[PDB]
Design a binder for this molecule. Structure first.
Ligand SMILES: CCCCCCCC/C=C\CCCCCCCC(=O)OC[C@H](O)CO
Ligand SMILES: CCCCCCCC/C=C\CCCCCCCC(=O)OC[C@H](O)CO
Ligand SMILES: CCCCCCCC/C=C\CCCCCCCC(=O)OC[C@H](O)CO
Ligand SMILES: CCCCCCCC/C=C\CCCCCCCC(=O)OC[C@H](O)CO
Ligand SMILES: CCCCCCCC/C=C\CCCCCCCC(=O)OC[C@H](O)CO
Ligand SMILES: CCCCCCCC/C=C\CCCCCCCC(=O)OC[C@H](O)CO
Ligand SMILES: CCCCCCCC/C=C\CCCCCCCC(=O)OC[C@H](O)CO
Ligand SMILES: CCCCCCCC/C=C\CCCCCCCC(=O)OC[C@H](O)CO
Ligand SMILES: CCCCCCCC/C=C\CCCCCCCC(=O)OC[C@H](O)CO
Ligand SMILES: CCCCCCCC/C=C\CCCCCCCC(=O)OC[C@H](O)CO
Ligand SMILES: CCCCCCCC/C=C\CCCCCCCC(=O)OC[C@H](O)CO
Ligand SMILES: CCCCCCCC/C=C\CCCCCCCC(=O)OC[C@H](O)CO
Ligand SMILES: CCCCCCCC/C=C\CCCCCCCC(=O)OC[C@H](O)CO
Ligand SMILES: CCCCCCCC/C=C\CCCCCCCC(=O)OC[C@H](O)CO
Ligand SMILES: CCCCCCCC/C=C\CCCCCCCC(=O)OC[C@H](O)CO
Ligand SMILES: CCCCCCCC/C=C\CCCCCCCC(=O)OC[C@H](O)CO
Ligand SMILES: [Cl-]
Ligand code: NA
Length: 392
């Protein structure tokens, strides 16, 4: 359940934008970022899931009930900015895929995306589970296509091997590496994963809590391992397809279908846009629902779901009216998301290390140290990037 609701967020249009642009512009040199961020997500999402299992509350709820009111207010504001940056990539990714399929302008693609998302808001298991199993099938099959294409493309193994050595090539590579981290370590899922596993116990016992931790850990790592293989394959295929060939608009999502042309042939254009649309519509609905859970946990109240859906569409329509490139703003949103990670990490690392919160399920001291090292690494990368974007 939670590991699957997770996995669909790790294959949103934000991942497509950063993987294709990462491989086309920098070859295989950013393969280590995908591997590092995926292993970071395994640790962080396991802690978030263990927080809801052990304590019975989600991370926003614990912040609201334990921290001072002004700090809860600041944490709610930054979490809403994370929610809008999350939905900005997924809503535009669906509107872009509409243009790839029908040829409509981006504004009309967003109007269609707006009507669909409002319609998708009103639903239930009688209608969601088919639509959710469908979007899961299209996105996973395309993921398998990249797993197959990465072998058929015959990538330069000397360049692939060197790509797993941590190496940054100027500020442009740091900008895209931070976007890859934000697209994999998503703060909105950090808050959401605790709510997905709360209230799932059956006998209210430590032994029952330990099992759900053991079960969730296997489901998360297996799902994260599959998502990591696909993202590495998609970047490696994008490198074998565009890197060094000096193709115009290489790395853009409008020509990303050419990565699967030697495999899918003429159908690569439709099958990629259908996957991009299904990935965008499902994740944008999931993010909207998680945004209401985050607000309810921080503030105790919420705004109507139609108003939240209306407010988050404003940055999408503004970007389209400005004529900005969709693939560029999808990557920018993932970069902003990476700046929301350390804010989500600090309460997670603190709450999961307390006995009055976790009970007998206190996080092992080694994994708490590993989590703080992950927080310092991300803070250093986000400070290094900010340093490059200001001046010397
Ligand atoms: C196998 C898991 C390793 C972690 C992910 C692999 C990519 C980043 C780390 C590379 C080597 C560690 C750093 C060595 C050079 C400094
Ligand atoms: C997307 C995340 C990227 C990282 C973004 C980090 C910066 C956060 C941005 C704005 C915070 C500004 C809002 C200031 C917080 C107001 C809280 C406050 O002081 O209000 C007092 C309270 O109302 C009395 O109880
Ligand atoms: C995706 C990142 C933003 C890009 C959007 C650009 C176009 C919209 C302009 C500003 C939106 C910022 C307003 C949202 C502020 C956080 C939500 C909030 O809670 O409002 C704080 C208020 O002060 C509570 O009292
Ligand atoms: C950068 C490297 C990151 C790659 C991560 C995944 C690695 C391999 C994909 C495994 C998927 C197994 C399917 C492979 C497709 C296949 O079997 O190839 C057919 C053969 O080449 C002719 O028929
Ligand atoms: C078709 C391929 C599927 C995608 C690549 C799959 C695995 C690559 C394995 C990692 C790279 C291994 C090759 C390393 C290399 O060639 O150089 C040796 C290295 O420098 C001295 O340790
Ligand atoms: C699960 C198993 C994981 C083991 C490690 C995966 C590494 C495989 C390296 C070999 C890559 C296979 C394709 C490379 C073929 C090659 O290098 O040359 C063939 C030439 O291109 C055509 O004649
Ligand atoms: C391999 C890394 C994950 C193993 C660490 C699990 C752990 O530290 O504790 C297990 C706990 O008992 C679960 O019920
Ligand atoms: C996403 C988590 C599961 C994905 C697992 C992917 C395995 C690739 C690991 C190391 C590549 C080894 C490359 C070593 C070559 C370096 C020497 C040049
Ligand atoms: C059997 C179930 C039916 C499967 C139906 C779904 C798969 C789509 C199949 C063919 C689409 C062919 C139409 C596009 C023709 C290819 C043209 C091309 O070369 O690429 C696209 C073009 O470049 C863009 O600008
Ligand atoms: C400034 C950012 C945008 C904010 C500006 C708002 C835009 C409102 C436009 C159309 C209303 C949509 C129709 C909604 C119909 C309301 C139905 C209703 O009365 O119930 C909901 C009520 O608000 C509680 O339950
Ligand atoms: C630059 C952002 C880096 C890390 C986020 C900093 C965390 C934001 C503030 C942490 C709140 C806190 O530390 O509160 C702990 C204590 O239990 C309540 O008083
Ligand atoms: C700054 C980087 C790492 C330090 C992380 C801050 C320390 C977080 C650990 C706090 C804790 O859990 O307890 C420590 C001590 O026993 C009572 O504060
Ligand atoms: C770059 C640094 C990344 C390092 C990559 C390491 C790979 C480990 C990944 C997942 C293990 C699962 C996370 C285990 C942490 C939570 C388990 C735990 O601590 O559980 C304690 C409690 O007692 C429960 O019963
Ligand atoms: C990067 C990982 C650096 C710390 C490695 C570790 O696991 O340390 C455990 C700790 O020393 C046990 O209390
Ligand atoms: C800069 C180099 C290292 C930063 C700090 C390295 C990370 C050390 C922080 C580990 C920590 O906070 O210790 C938690 C422990 O469990 C107490 O509760
Ligand atoms: C907001 C997401 C994380 C951004 C954190 C960078 C902002 C740097 C400023 C203060 C942090 C404390 C000093 C850290 C600066 C070291 C990295 C340069
Ligand atoms: Cl090369
Ligand atoms: Na574009």
């Amino acid at each position: 359940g939670p590991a699957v609701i997770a996995s669909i967020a790790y294959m949103d249009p934000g991942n497509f934008a950063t993987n294709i642009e990462g491989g086309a512009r920098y070859g295989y040199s950013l393969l280590w970022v995908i591997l590092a961020a995926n292993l970071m997500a395994m640790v962080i999402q396991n802690l978030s899931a263990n927080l809801g299992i052990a304590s019975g509350r989600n991370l926003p709820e614990l912040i609201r009930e334990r921290w001072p009111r002004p700090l809860v207010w600041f944490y709610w504001i930054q979490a809403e900015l994370v929610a809008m940056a999350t939905d900005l990539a997924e809503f535009l990714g669906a509107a872009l895929a509409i243009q790839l399929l029908t040829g409509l302008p981006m504004f009309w693609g967003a109007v269609v995306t707006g009507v669909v998302t409002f319609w998708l808001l009103n639903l239930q298991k009688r209608g969601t589970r088919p639509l959710e199993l469908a979007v899961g099938a299209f996105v996973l099959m395309i993921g398998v296509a990249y797993l197959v294409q990465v072998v058929l493309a015959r990538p330069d193994l000397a360049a692939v091997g060197a790509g797993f050595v941590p190496r940054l090539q100027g500020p442009g590579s740091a900008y895209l590496a931070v976007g890859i981290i934000g697209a994999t370590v998503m703060p909105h899922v950090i808050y959401l994963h605790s709510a997905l596993t709360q209230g799932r116990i059956q006998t209210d016992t430590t032994e029952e809590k330990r099992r759900l931790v053991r079960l969730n850990r296997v489901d998360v790592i297996a799902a994260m391992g599959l998502a990591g293989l696909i993202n590495m394959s998609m970047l490696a295929v994008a490198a074998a397809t565009f890197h060094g060939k000096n193709v115009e608009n290489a790395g853009d999502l409008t020509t990303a279908y050419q990565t699967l042309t030697p495999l899918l042939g003429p159908a690569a254009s439709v099958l990629f846009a259908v996957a991009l649309l299904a990935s965008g519509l499902s994740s944008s609905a999931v993010g909207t629902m998680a945004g209401d859970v985050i607000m309810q946990g921080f503030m105790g109240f919420h705004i109507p779901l139609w108003l939240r859906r209306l407010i988050t569409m404003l940055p999408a329509f503004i970007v389209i009216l400005l004529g900005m490139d969709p693939s560029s703003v999808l990557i920018l949103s993932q970069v902003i998301l990476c700046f929301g990670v350390p804010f989500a990490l600090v309460p997670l690392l603190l709450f999961t290390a307390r006995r009055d919160v976790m009970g007998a399920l206190v996080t092992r001291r080694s994994f708490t140290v590993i989590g703080w090292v992950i927080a310092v690494i991300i803070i250093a990368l986000n400070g290094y990037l900010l340093w490059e974007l200001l001046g010397g």
